[PDB]
Amino acid sequence: LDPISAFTESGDRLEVQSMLLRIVDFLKNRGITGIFTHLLSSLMDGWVLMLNREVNGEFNRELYLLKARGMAHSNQVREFLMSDRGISLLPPHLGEGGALTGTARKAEEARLRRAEIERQTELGRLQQQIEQRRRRARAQIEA
Amino acid sequence: AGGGFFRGSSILVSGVAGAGKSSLAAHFAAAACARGERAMYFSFEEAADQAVRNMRSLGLDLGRWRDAGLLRFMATRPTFYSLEMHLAVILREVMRFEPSVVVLDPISAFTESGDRLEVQSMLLRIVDFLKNRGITGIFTHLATTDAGLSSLMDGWVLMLNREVNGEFNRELYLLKARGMAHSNQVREFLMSDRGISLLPPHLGEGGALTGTARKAEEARLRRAEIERQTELGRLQQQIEQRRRRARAQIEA
Amino acid sequence: PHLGEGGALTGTARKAEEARLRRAEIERQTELGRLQQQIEQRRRRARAQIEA
Amino acid sequence: LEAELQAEEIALKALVESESA
Ligand SMILES: Nc1ncnc2c1ncn2[C@@H]1O[C@H](COP(=O)(O)OP(=O)(O)O)[C@@H](O)[C@H]1O
Ligand SMILES: [Mg+2]
C-alpha cells in the first residue's frame, strides 16, 4: 500500500482509521503479508523507519527498525545506500562518536587514521631523541 | 516500598511504540494467574493467538493460563462499537469473570472514536468500577507533552525507547506510586528470552547513562585509572633514579 | 536555599559538587603545606651552601 | 650521569603519556 497517507490527509480521522483497521484485519485473516508505506503506528506488527537527514550540508540515508513484536530487532541505526546493484545496508562504526553513518563517518575514519600516523611519528621522534641523549651520555662518560 | 503496588490500584504503563508496555502488562496478568488468581486482558489492537506467540519470545507461556481459564483474552476493536457499548461489554465480561487483575491495552485506542469529554467519562467509569470492585487495573497508553489521564491512575510506569548516538536504548521510570516510597531512578529494562530485566543505574559523574553510554563511561574510568597508575609509577621511578644520582654525587 | 554561583543543582549533582568543593579545600591545604615545607628545605640548601 | 639519563628517559615517556591524555 504505497502510500496510505493519501487516505488520511483528506478523510475524517475516525473514518480513515476504521478503513485502515478493516484492511489490516482482512489481510491478516487471509494470511497475507501487508506492507504499508507512510509519510497511529501501534496497529502494525513491525515498523521500519527510513530517513534522509541533513548532515553538514550533505544529505545521508539511514534506515533502522524500531518495532517487531515477536522477535529481537537490532536497536542500531544502519546506513542504507541505494544503487543500481540494489539497496544495501552498511553497519555503523562502533566506538567513539557512536555511529555517524555518513560522510562524517568517512571524516572520522580519516581523522583517526591521521591521529594514528601522528602517534607513530611522535613516538619515533621520542625514540630518536632518547637514542641521541644516550649517545651524549656515553660521550660525556668517556670524557 | 512494601513489595509493589497496592492491590486496589490503577496503574498506567505509558510509552512510545516498541517500549514493551504490553509486555509489562502481560507480566502483571501472568503473575495474577500464577498466584492462583484469575485475570482479564482486553486487547484493542492485537489478536490473542498473536499475543501468545509474541510473548513466548519474552518467555511467558500465557497459553497455559488461558487453557486453565485463569486468563480471558478479549479482543475487540475501537471502531467496531460505540464507546458506550465498549464500556457495557467490558463491564459485563468482567462481572461474569470476576477477575483480580484487568489489563486494558491500549486505552489510547478509545480516543478518536468519540468526543474527548465522553472519552474521559468512559475511562473514569471503567477506573471507578475496577477500583470499587477491588480489582487491580493496568492501563497501557501510547505517545512528550500533556496527557491528563495520569491523575485518574494511582501508579505511573513510563517506558521509553530513546535514541542515543544511533542506538535505541530501553529505559524504565517509576514516575508515581501514590501512598508509597519509590525510586526516583531510571532503571534499564532489557527485553530478553528469560524475561524483562531491570538493571540498576551507574551512580557517579554524568548520571546513570544506562546503556552503551554506561559502557563508555565505565571504559573511560578504566582507561583513566590505568593512566593515573602509570603516571604514579613513572614519577616514583623518576624519584628513585634522581635519588640514586644525588647519593652518587654525595659519594663523589 | 542554594546560594552563590553553581545553581540550585538539587540532587546527587548538588551533593557531588559539595564533595568536589570539600576535596578542593583539602587540596588547597595540602598545596599550602607542601609549599611551606619546600621553602624550609630550599632554605636548608642555601644555608648549607653558605656554610660551605 | 647515567642515572640522570635514565630519569630523562622516564620523563619523556611521561610526556608522551600526558600528550595521550
Ligand atoms: N526475544 C526478544 N529479545 C529482545 N526483544 C524482544 C524479544 N521479544 C520481543 N522483544 C521486543 O518487544 C517489543 C514489543 O513490545 P510491545 O509490548 O509490543 O510494546 P508496545 O506495546 O509499545 O508495542 C519489540 O520491539 C521487540 O524488540
Ligand atoms: Mg502492543
Side-chain angles (χ1 to χ4, degrees), chain A residues 66-73, chain B residues 16-23 45 54-55 57-58 105 142 170 191-193:
Chain A
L66 67 168
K67 196 171 162 184
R69 283 193 228 270
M71 310 175 311
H73 70 72
Chain B
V16 294
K21 53 216 204 48
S22 314
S23 308
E45 74 185 13
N54 288 346
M55 303 283 92
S57 311
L58 297 173
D105 162 67
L142 186 77
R170 278 195 172 96
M191 317 265 281
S192 183
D193 287 359

Side-chain angles (χ1 to χ4, degrees), chain B residues 86-96 125-126 129:
Chain B
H86 273 302
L87 173 69
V89 173
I90 292 162
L91 295 165
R92 174 173 61 213
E93 280 275 11
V94 166
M95 284 180 187
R96 58 179 289 186
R125 290 165 197 180
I126 295 159
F129 177 73

Side-chain angles (χ1 to χ4, degrees), chain B residues 1-193 195-239 241-244 246-252:
Chain B
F5 304 85
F6 288 112
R7 176 167 61 168
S9 54
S10 267
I11 296 159
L12 182 65
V13 190
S14 86
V16 294
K21 53 216 204 48
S22 314
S23 308
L24 181 62
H27 275 112
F28 260 90
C33 302
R35 291 194 301 277
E37 317 189 346
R38 176 168 298 99
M40 288 210 74
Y41 206 105
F42 284 95
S43 179
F44 307 135
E45 74 185 13
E46 198 180 347
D49 306 300
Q50 187 197 335
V52 172
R53 177 202 63 187
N54 288 346
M55 303 283 92
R56 271 194 293 102
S57 311
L58 297 173
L60 283 173
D61 186 0
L62 297 161
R64 186 216 304 180
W65 310 116
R66 182 187 63 185
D67 294 353
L70 305 181
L71 178 59
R72 291 283 183 175
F73 204 105
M74 170 90 183
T76 193
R77 282 276 187 188
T79 65
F80 295 3
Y81 280 91
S82 58
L83 294 192
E84 315 308 322
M85 276 158 184
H86 273 302
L87 173 69
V89 173
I90 292 162
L91 295 165
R92 174 173 61 213
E93 280 275 11
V94 166
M95 284 180 187
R96 58 179 289 186
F97 181 70
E98 218 161 19
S100 63
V101 171
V102 158
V103 174
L104 306 183
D105 162 67
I107 63 153
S108 70
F110 311 141
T111 47
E112 174 47 33
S113 282
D115 201 317
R116 307 312 175 278
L117 164 66
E118 296 168 339
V119 169
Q120 204 74 1
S121 315
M122 171 186 189
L123 183 60
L124 170 67
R125 290 165 197 180
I126 295 159
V127 166
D128 289 351
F129 177 73
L130 290 161
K131 286 180 180 175
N132 164 255
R133 302 253 289 179
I135 301 174
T136 310
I138 288 93
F139 289 64
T140 86
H141 198 271
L142 186 77
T144 307
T145 62
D146 200 274
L149 317 160
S150 39
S151 91
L152 297 181
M153 314 279 150
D154 304 344
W156 195 355
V157 172
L158 172 64
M159 308 207 106
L160 212 64
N161 205 38
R162 224 194 256 279
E163 188 257 352
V164 172
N165 227 356
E167 209 185 77
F168 277 90
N169 280 312
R170 278 195 172 96
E171 291 179 313
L172 188 158
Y173 306 65
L174 180 54
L175 300 191
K176 182 178 83 169
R178 274 198 273 187
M180 294 207 297
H182 66 138
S183 206
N184 61 336
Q185 300 272 278
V186 191
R187 306 287 182 80
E188 182 180 6
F189 78 104
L190 253 70
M191 317 265 281
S192 183
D193 287 359
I196 293 174
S197 304
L198 288 157
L199 307 177
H202 159 70
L203 297 94
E205 286 269 309
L209 291 76
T210 78
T212 53
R214 178 179 67 80
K215 300 197 180 293
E217 216 69 354
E218 191 175 24
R220 160 170 163 277
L221 272 38
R222 186 193 318 282
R223 290 168 282 187
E225 196 74 355
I226 295 299
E227 191 277 337
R228 183 186 138 283
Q229 282 196 10
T230 60
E231 190 81 340
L232 264 284
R234 245 65 199 172
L235 300 206
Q236 181 282 133
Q237 209 73 13
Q238 289 192 71
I239 286 164
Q241 262 53 230
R242 286 172 178 178
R243 171 182 305 157
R244 294 206 310 105
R247 291 188 316 100
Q249 286 183 353
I250 285 167
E251 183 198 28

